[PDB]
Amino acid sequence: GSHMASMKKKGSVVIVGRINLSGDTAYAQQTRGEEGCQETSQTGRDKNQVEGEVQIVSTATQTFLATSINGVLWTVYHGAGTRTIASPKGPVTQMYTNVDKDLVGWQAPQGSRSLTPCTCGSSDLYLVTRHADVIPVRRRGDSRGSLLSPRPISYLKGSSGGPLLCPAGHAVGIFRAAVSTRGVAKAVDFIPVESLETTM
Numbered sequence: 273g274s275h276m277a278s279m280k281k282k283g284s285v286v287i288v289g290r291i292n293l294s295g296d297t298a299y300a301q302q303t304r305g306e307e308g309c310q311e312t313s314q315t316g317r318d319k320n321q322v323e324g325e326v327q328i329v330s331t332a333t334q335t336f337l338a339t340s341i342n343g344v345l346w347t348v349y350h351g352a353g354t355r356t357i358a359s360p361k362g363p364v365t366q367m368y369t370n371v372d373k374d375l376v377g378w379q380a381p382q383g384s385r386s387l388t389p390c391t392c393g394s395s396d397l398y399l400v401t402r403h404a405d406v407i408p409v410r411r412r413g414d415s416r417g418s419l420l421s422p423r424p425i426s427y428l429k430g431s432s433g434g435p436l437l438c439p440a441g442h443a444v445g446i447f448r449a450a451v452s453t454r455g456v457a458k459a460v461d462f463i464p465v466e467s468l469e470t471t472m
């Protein structure tokens with residue numbers, strides 16, 4: 273538009289839940305409903321206590337995941353764009369932005385826990401989805417892995433930004449895109465943790 277006085281501001285990304293991995297059972301928890309999410313996106317002020325490594329995040333139009341690794345909350349650019357994230361003292365600007373990698377990052381929220389970058393060199397991985405499904409993935413290249421059991425794309429939608437983990441629970445990568453044919457996801461593409469470590 274040409275009328276700057278009425279130009280709108282995009283809201284903040286908002287943490288609305290988490291994938292609980294602290295015990296023997298993975299499960300999703302919601303920490304904020306849709307109305308409170310809307311309010312928090314506009315103010316950028318989120319007073320909720322943050323816990324865990326994998327957050328469920330939302331904008332006005334999308335929901336996806338974000339994963340703390342080495343004190344940075346990482347997610348995908350196709351979800352967050354250049355948006356700030358809401359925090360107790362207001363909006364927080366991204367400290368990493370790389371559209372070529374489909375990658376953004378903010379300082380990790382106070383109270384969050386960070387995953388350690390994997391140095392195991394192992395190819396037996398586990399994808400964690402927004403529904404707290406743990407999906408075995410065999411690593412097939414620097415940024416690719418195959419599902420041991422393929423599943424319709426619907427079961428992976430909304431899990432970009434989530435982690436691929438090694439058998440020891442280290443972060444190996446961030447889920448970016450799916451490889452699907454006839455609607456069935458047979459493989460996943462992820463941002464390797466080394467690419468995060470280079471971006472850092």
Ligand SMILES: CC(C)(C)[C@@H]1NC(=O)O[C@@H]2CCC[C@H]2OC/C=C/C(F)(F)c2nc3ccccc3nc2O[C@@H]2C[C@@H](C(=O)N[C@]3(C(=O)NS(=O)(=O)C4(C)CC4)C[C@H]3C(F)F)N(C2)C1=O
Pocket residue numbers: 334335336337349350351371373374425428429430431432447448449450451452457461
């Ligand atoms: C056909 C398909 C499955 C839709 C698509 N496959 C696909 O493109 O595969 C090719 C071949 C193998 C790698 C990939 O190379 C292209 C790179 C794509 C990309 F990822 F780097 C990407 N960079 C962007 C940078 C800037 C702006 C937009 C971008 N858009 C991108 O990709 C787009 C988005 C990405 C996506 O849907 N991700 C997921 C997801 O859950 N999102 S989400 O949470 O619902 C949501 C949309 C709320 C945020 C995990 C997959 C879930 F659904 F399984 N896409 C399309 C796909 O996965």
Ligand SMILES: [Zn+2]
Pocket residue numbers: 389390391392393394438439440441442
């Ligand atoms: Zn490891």
